[PDB]
Symmetry: D2
Subunit: 308 residues, 4 copies
């Protein structure tokens, strides 16, 4: 059987796991390590870095990775890994929307399908994956869609990669944007990422949140804008100013699906802004950080946002 | 024919009676420009004058159609939903495509909005939003896609009705209390309490929050992660704010579902309020209105459970 | 505690139930009877009738009803009950998309939420309900949306009535079309319903399926049409003929959401057809049957389709 | 500019080069009326002439746009998806609103269809359907709502791309084999095997099924309940049909999800084939094509697993 490493980041989503869900040993030789233990609402740069470094380091001593993670920021960590992992093997993330002690807990079957997915030769080369509710989803498009439903995770713009039925996966899609080993981002020698904060836009929005970050010298700000990436009067003036003094700004949107498009609502080229495409604000933050270890040029950051 | 007043807040979404002549077959239309701005610039002032206007001219017309940008449409709708005291239908409409583009959506949207406003059956269902052949309630409606003509949906509870050929099949009506059943009256107000929103994500900074607490904001709404949870730093900052008078609502960046009470965070211990299904921008509207009435978290929660 | 009767129609969706899901006895006094035992793909007129007659007969000796049922035809039985039950008390239907022995089986929590719903004073007067995946759905709009997902049941046109969190229900909607005790349909003295069959429309469709039913003297045919209730050349000619000789025909659609509207695509008044509104074909069959015990007039059957 | 041929199958969805002049900014357009019918009347003949035409004129143009009714659009798309042998893009488009209604959708749909057909990037993605700013693959696309302009979606796997300002962001491409990678060639055919569809519901009659078996149909597709299950009577009838040569595919009336193999029904024991995610109308298309190749259920299943 294939050797699969389980990397745990928080509490257990089932019930070692192998004793709590004994069916696991019919599809794989499982072994687990606790790399950290926190609720995902506390996820941060440190954890990301040690996760990536680990996966890259232990890549050759296993056939696949399953990463146990809270649902709250799952979509964030998934995209980060999608851009920094250099392992050929499958890296699959999984979680549970119900506590492992509640009746009809979802963790056990999710964990099982995650291992099934990691052990499938066909899962290789599709980038970092998230398996939930019988579905294989790519790290880039997947997002949390409902606060409590077991079926909350969906790839809202472009759809899932596959569905699992009885331990078999029917793959009918694979991501087109470049990921993992095709990206130029390498964090193996990094101890911190650039600082990137997110501001929200709504009626009568205050410019203070933005000004606080510009004053603390943040490397980039991501704007959760209204509609197709638009911004409130005040927030606009503040960010426009930031940009011409070296702060990098990405226009994203609080609207949950669709792309924030280039030069449509805002003259990006005139102000030096970057449009995030379909990346929502939290995902746009992950990319902007990674771009910033590479360049400060908005014209180039845009190219990056068009390729990954 | 019914008299319908069109209140314009921005540019024209069509081309009105001359641009879409079919209008005078269902109503006697008249329009005024109350303000002219893009909705991404919508603000407290505008809201107040809109409400005062509707309440004041309520008796000289049978229904209102409000032309508005889609960007903050869902915000204004909820505000009106809570402050209008007119029995008559108040309908909001917009367009996702410029009126000059081919296949522009404004004309038929405007048409169906007037149809909706002139329908006797539309009365008493609170402020409505009509887009893409659908009648949606001001509370649940939200922008779902950045560019799709079909972007507006009532994501948690669904639409009130569908329009086909100028007839509306109503199969639902809002249960939360709205318009004339709320205790909020802004007719004598010139400003609303100050309420800001902060976002949560991995490694989130506490600075945005601290900026608002330092400027003495009356309330902060937190766009949390998952079921209204917060990042370490933002938590500590908001928890402190709350015990010094600042009101804090836990909402969520997750587009559908309720942020529930005392599940993820001990709301009672810290004095927080959970927003239910109100997304952050909508939660800001209600917190503002609540704050003109009370500063008690235990009561603000009650308000969040009723409206 | 409230007394709740569980009426079982097939296999058990959990594991008496009270021993398999012991939490039940904290919210209700439960008692169960097996009225029949079949897979729901075999549901039929007989079963419907005995279900309705039972609920109506035992109405006064309990506070609420939970009906255990297969998912396959759930939406059919739910609507039938929605139109024939005369009990004031709550009638809630529930099922499971996963076998009760599979890991992460959904039956137990569904059953629990169904009992919670039935015992809630607020559930009364909202018509027959279906509780699945933490959601309260009305019998009329609810349909099966996916072949295997635990979250398959949704009220696709008008939305759910409420969501359950921790045994509390937040109701924010109630159905407007008349149901249960406001309908004129009474089956308490019936031993059979009129015969109503369904035909499908697609490219190059054959007229044989329709002609078979007209020749066997069916009381009504429901057409699963294409688009907004349209029909294929051949099927059209055959049904148009049927209608002017006394067969009642409803135009519905195979498209899963939206209304099949009146006189839009087909001149209903000229041919004597009835449009189903938002009722999908299987649901339109249930109503047509019930209307037929009352009238053969198409003009009137249409009124019925506009009221229930 | 690229030369694009528009093949019309019904009425005009716009008003073409004169009705939507912007067209001549992106392509040299030319059109022919190959047939003229409402798509609810689409049939085998039309399909065959469409395919033969595209294959025959493939070299005298850079791309095809096919104008077609929305009712059976999803059926024709899949058929072409399996029988076209042209490298060039073949795009289908329609309109949910009559070209004379205000806010008619045909013009911009047509525009984006031509844009799509002229894009070098659209090549090799199989037959496409362009509606409401979206590029969808012929296999997964289906009609989702009876009247909404946004009705077409690829409900199981999602769209291939979104169009904004005449640029397409492609992020997906179909994995199942299509067009020139399939073994189906109808260039020498004058008729397809006969395949009918039956529906399942409570108390379903077996007559519809029996009518087709008695008329010697080559195959029957069953729109089953749930995961492809069948009613008592329909089951017994189809099971019998299968062991006498009739081919039977279990599909489902449930609009999304796969009907899976050997889960609910023992397909191997009765000789049935499960359709996977193909809905009944789409399952009919593939069964027809398979039947021109084989009558073996074990092999028809393989076909259903590959295309």
């Amino acid at each position: 059987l294939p050797n699969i490493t389980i990397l745990a980041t928080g509490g257990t989503i089932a019930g070692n796991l192998v004793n709590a869900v004994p069916q696991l040993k019919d599809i794989a030789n499982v072994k687990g390590e606790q790399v950290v233990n926190i609720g995902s609402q506390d996820m941060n740069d440190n954890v990301w870095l040690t996760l990536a470094k680990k996966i890259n380091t232990d890549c050759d001593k296993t056939d696949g990775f399953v990463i146990t993670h809270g649902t709250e920021t799952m979509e964030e960590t998934a995209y980060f890994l999608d851009l920094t992992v250099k392992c050929d093997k499958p890296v699959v993330m999984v979680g549970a929307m119900r506590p492992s002690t509640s009746m009809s807990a979802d963790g056990p079957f999710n964990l099982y399908n995650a291992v099934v997915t990691a052990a499938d030769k066909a899962s290789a080369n599709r980038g970092v994956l998230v398996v939930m509710n019988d579905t294989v989803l790519d790290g880039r498009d997947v997002t949390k869609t409902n606060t409590t439903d077991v079926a909350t995770f969906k790839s809202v713009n472009y759809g899932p990669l596959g569905y699992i039925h009885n331990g078999k996966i029917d793959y009918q899609r694979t991501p087109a944007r470049k990921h993992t080993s095709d990206t130029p981002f390498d964090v193996s020698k990094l101890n911190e990422l650039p600082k990137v904060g997110i501001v929200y836009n709504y009626a009568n929005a205050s410019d203070l949140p933005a000004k606080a970050l510009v004053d603390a010298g943040y490397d980039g700000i991501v704007s959760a804008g209204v509609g197709n990436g638009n911004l409130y009067k005040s927030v606009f003036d503040t960010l426009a100013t930031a940009a011409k003094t070296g702060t990098a700004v990405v226009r994203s949107s609080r609207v949950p699906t669709g792309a924030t498009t280039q030069d449509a609502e805002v003259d990006d080229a005139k102000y030096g802004f970057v449009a995030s495409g379909t990346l929502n604000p939290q995902k746009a933050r992950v990319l902007l950080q990674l771009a910033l270890t590479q360049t400060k040029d908005p014209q180039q950051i845009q190219q990056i946002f068009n390729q990954y």
